[PDB]
Design an enzyme around this catalytic site. Sequence first.
Site, PDB file in Angstrom:
ATOM      1  N   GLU A 117      -1.228 -10.021  11.057  1.00  0.00           N
ATOM      2  CA  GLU A 117      -1.073  -9.463   9.694  1.00  0.00           C
ATOM      3  C   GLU A 117       0.406  -9.170   9.435  1.00  0.00           C
ATOM      4  O   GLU A 117       0.879  -9.354   8.323  1.00  0.00           O
ATOM      5  CB  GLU A 117      -1.929  -8.183   9.626  1.00  0.00           C
ATOM      6  N   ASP A 144       0.861  -1.202   0.000  1.00  0.00           N
ATOM      7  CA  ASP A 144       0.000   0.000   0.000  1.00  0.00           C
ATOM      8  C   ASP A 144       0.886   1.237   0.000  1.00  0.00           C
ATOM      9  O   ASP A 144       0.761   2.005  -0.926  1.00  0.00           O
ATOM     10  CB  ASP A 144      -1.009  -0.039   1.163  1.00  0.00           C
TER      11      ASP A 144
HETATM   12  C1  LIG Z   1      -3.520   2.667   8.997  1.00  0.00           C
HETATM   13  S1  LIG Z   1      -3.799   0.928   8.504  1.00  0.00           S
HETATM   14  O1  LIG Z   1      -2.505   0.032   8.984  1.00  0.00           O
HETATM   15  O2  LIG Z   1      -5.149   0.176   9.119  1.00  0.00           O
HETATM   16  C2  LIG Z   1      -3.886   0.948   6.702  1.00  0.00           C
HETATM   17  C3  LIG Z   1      -2.878   1.633   6.079  1.00  0.00           C
HETATM   18  C4  LIG Z   1      -2.838   1.690   4.695  1.00  0.00           C
HETATM   19 BR1  LIG Z   1      -1.339   2.668   3.962  1.00  0.00          BR
HETATM   20  C5  LIG Z   1      -3.802   1.071   3.905  1.00  0.00           C
HETATM   21  C6  LIG Z   1      -4.822   0.375   4.555  1.00  0.00           C
HETATM   22  N1  LIG Z   1      -5.865  -0.297   3.776  1.00  0.00           N
HETATM   23  C7  LIG Z   1      -6.938  -0.986   4.481  1.00  0.00           C
HETATM   24  C8  LIG Z   1      -7.191  -2.418   3.970  1.00  0.00           C
HETATM   25  C9  LIG Z   1      -8.315  -2.649   3.197  1.00  0.00           C
HETATM   26  C10 LIG Z   1      -8.556  -3.945   2.751  1.00  0.00           C
HETATM   27  C11 LIG Z   1      -7.700  -5.002   3.066  1.00  0.00           C
HETATM   28  C12 LIG Z   1      -6.568  -4.782   3.844  1.00  0.00           C
HETATM   29  C13 LIG Z   1      -5.615  -5.964   4.163  1.00  0.00           C
HETATM   30  N2  LIG Z   1      -4.734  -6.117   3.309  1.00  0.00           N
HETATM   31  C14 LIG Z   1      -3.852  -4.973   3.144  1.00  0.00           C
HETATM   32  C15 LIG Z   1      -2.601  -5.419   2.331  1.00  0.00           C
HETATM   33  O3  LIG Z   1      -1.657  -4.351   2.202  1.00  0.00           O
HETATM   34  C16 LIG Z   1      -2.996  -5.866   1.006  1.00  0.00           C
HETATM   35  O4  LIG Z   1      -1.734  -6.255   0.308  1.00  0.00           O
HETATM   36  C17 LIG Z   1      -3.902  -7.007   1.153  1.00  0.00           C
HETATM   37  O5  LIG Z   1      -4.260  -7.606  -0.113  1.00  0.00           O
HETATM   38  C18 LIG Z   1      -5.154  -6.643   2.008  1.00  0.00           C
HETATM   39  C19 LIG Z   1      -6.001  -7.914   2.190  1.00  0.00           C
HETATM   40  O6  LIG Z   1      -5.234  -8.849   2.894  1.00  0.00           O
HETATM   41  C20 LIG Z   1      -6.331  -3.480   4.303  1.00  0.00           C
HETATM   42  C21 LIG Z   1      -4.871   0.314   5.954  1.00  0.00           C
END
Ligand SMILES: CS(=O)(=O)c1cc(Br)cc(NCc2cccc(CN3C[C@H](O)[C@@H](O)[C@H](O)[C@H]3CO)c2)c1
Length: 765
Positions: free
Chosen positions: A735, A538
């Site tokens: 995660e 991300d």
């Molecule tokens: C501040 S936070 O740490 O909550 C934060 C910071 C940032 Br920047 C972006 C996000 N997006 C939220 C988000 C939505 C949907 C799924 C995921 C889980 N992951 C993220 C993985 O990166 C991805 O590769 C993988 O496919 C996907 C599914 O497993 C996460 C959150």
Amino acid sequence: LHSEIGRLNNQSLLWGPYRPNIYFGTRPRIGKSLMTGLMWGKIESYTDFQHTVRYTCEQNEGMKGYGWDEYDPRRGGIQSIHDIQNGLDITTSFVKIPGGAHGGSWAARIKGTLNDDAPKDQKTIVVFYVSQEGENSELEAVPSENEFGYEGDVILKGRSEALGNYKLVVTKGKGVIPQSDHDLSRLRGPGQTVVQSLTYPDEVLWQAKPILFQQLKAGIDWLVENKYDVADPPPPWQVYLLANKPGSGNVHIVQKVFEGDFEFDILFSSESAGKEVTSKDLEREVKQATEVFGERFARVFDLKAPFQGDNYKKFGKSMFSNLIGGIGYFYGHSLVDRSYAPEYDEENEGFWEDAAEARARHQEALEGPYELFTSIPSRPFFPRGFLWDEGFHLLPIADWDIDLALEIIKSWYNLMDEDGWIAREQILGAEARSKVPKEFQTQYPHYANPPTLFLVLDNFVERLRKLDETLSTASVDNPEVGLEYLRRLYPLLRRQFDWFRKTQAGDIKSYDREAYSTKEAYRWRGRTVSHCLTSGLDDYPRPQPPHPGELHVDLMSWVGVMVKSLISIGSLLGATEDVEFYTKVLDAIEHNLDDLHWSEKEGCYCDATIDEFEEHKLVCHKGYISLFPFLTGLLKPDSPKLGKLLALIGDESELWSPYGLRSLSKKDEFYGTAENYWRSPVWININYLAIVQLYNIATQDGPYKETARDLYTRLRKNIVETVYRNWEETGFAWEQYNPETGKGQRTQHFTGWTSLVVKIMSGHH
Ligand SMILES: CS(=O)(=O)c1cc(Br)cc(NCc2cccc(CN3C[C@H](O)[C@@H](O)[C@H](O)[C@H]3CO)c2)c1
Ligand SMILES: *[C@@H]1O[C@H](CO)[C@@H](O)[C@H](O)[C@H]1NC(C)=O
């Protein structure tokens, strides 16, 4: 024979607890059919049950943990739920019994034990909620003998085109049922199993909590109207006991109240099979499933040293079971922007503002319906298909059951549109959507995701070259069947390859860029000032500002993964014209990785931009991205560049932490900055790729054999032990892992690619 294996796989896999978004529920692999769910909650007051009732998966202070102790989707398994708020340890045992023409029969035991903190006299409400969608399908609760509810079993008789005739039984169960001495017992009975049979429009049957609460509220309104008041109120658990009204409908609510420990059974009997399922059958087939799970685990996941110990085996069984236990069946419409606005081309400077303006036209519309049969990253947080996650999920699952893995691959590629796009995130139906904020539902046909499903296909190809037991491997054991599967999928793989080259193209020809090929260069569409969501990493740092002349070395490396797979599968199918093209594209990427992406100054691969002065600039941020050609297996085992990458991988001051490889180097200016998602933490999916490539070099003649052997041995140990220690202390797969402390952080229940740990322990790649 391919048709014969297909039908047997269909019949084997049809029934499951394929609602991983809820603690416990069943549905078949059919869009519009019979679904069940479990609800429970303590009742101590006239207002607490709305706050204590459980249905959809969460993780918070009130829930210690939950997950599958053992699971295999052809047979069933056992789930443990540890609920602190409701003071209950719960077990849900689910077993499948083959027979008849309609996907066979199944049974569940629900068992609740108060923990040592709970009041011994705790009253617990349990609901079994049943719905059926379909215009011409029928479901009927047989009425009780008794006036006010059921002393014995609740029997549901139903019929559909899809399931034929069937009977669904909720047994009386065991446990104390509280009895009210209140006046209300003259009209509502003293306390017993009750059934309400209702009908709603098919599209809202999934809303079990609101449907249940609308019935509880109508009951309480009836009390108020009929002079039951605070002068002399019935007990809470009787106020929340539905009036018995069994009948026909497309919703049936079965409610029991228990004082202290309880258990009860659910028996689904397919009329097309032989005798009806019994509680004795359920106990026997549960014992049998465990025995068979145990024997397959020891064959497939033979944990090697130093993880041979029983503690590691229990850890491996927990991680594997929660991964394959997360398999869901989803059905419904997706939300897709099909405008193909020209702003989505991102050909100008500032393209993120143009694309934001296009998104703000809100031309997105529901389309489908679609179905998907897939594993998920997380039951409580991400209970849905993510495209590059599923490539990681299926590496252990394919070891377990290659025919299961190929079913899920087929399911994913059956979503591909005419152009070769699969949405990176599959939110199918209103139920799936209820968990996702509106701003985040819309899929975009220019957004890619890494093609990690090709890795699974590579493992299948290597296995092809070199009854539930028999079905699990039919597609490798019968080469005719294996090849026919690849013949049918091959065009879709090729279409996706062409889609990447057409939609994710980089610009060589329009700048002062020298390279061996004018064609091979790639740029992920969809990036914003601080992000690149489509790469999967991300917030991994990228050229600032984003720029239409950007080139991304991870994306080029992923195209290498795809060409190499198509050479393998093309060869097997004798697609000579295709293979000669692929061979020339691979050659081109090999040279262009060096000419566009290699930094001699820094000693690693880098993303590229163009300067303020329209010149090619490398932008080096040492981390996962830097290693991509090595992680994706594109480097010859004798490459001088490999050696420089091995030095970077092994360097404690850069990537190497005691707990695994850091996503970003401690030396990078962007280490631990902003949301710090992919800017320091240790991610098991990228560590798994590193571990597999180090092992490849360690088991081959060459200059780096011994360096690779040492790093392989240590990284395997560091990764396995970090995931294990956290599991031992917390009960959870996380995660990502903190590289300073080794602590699991972000999302719990990430099974999820963290479960690759079971493949790392079993080794022998
Ligand atoms: C501040 S936070 O740490 O909550 C934060 C910071 C940032 Br920047 C972006 C996000 N997006 C939220 C988000 C939505 C949907 C799924 C995921 C889980 N992951 C993220 C993985 O990166 C991805 O590769 C993988 O496919 C996907 C599914 O497993 C996460 C959150
Ligand atoms: C299983 O068989 C049914 C027969 O109605 C078919 O329509 C369905 O597509 C099959 N399931 C799959 C392809 O998994």
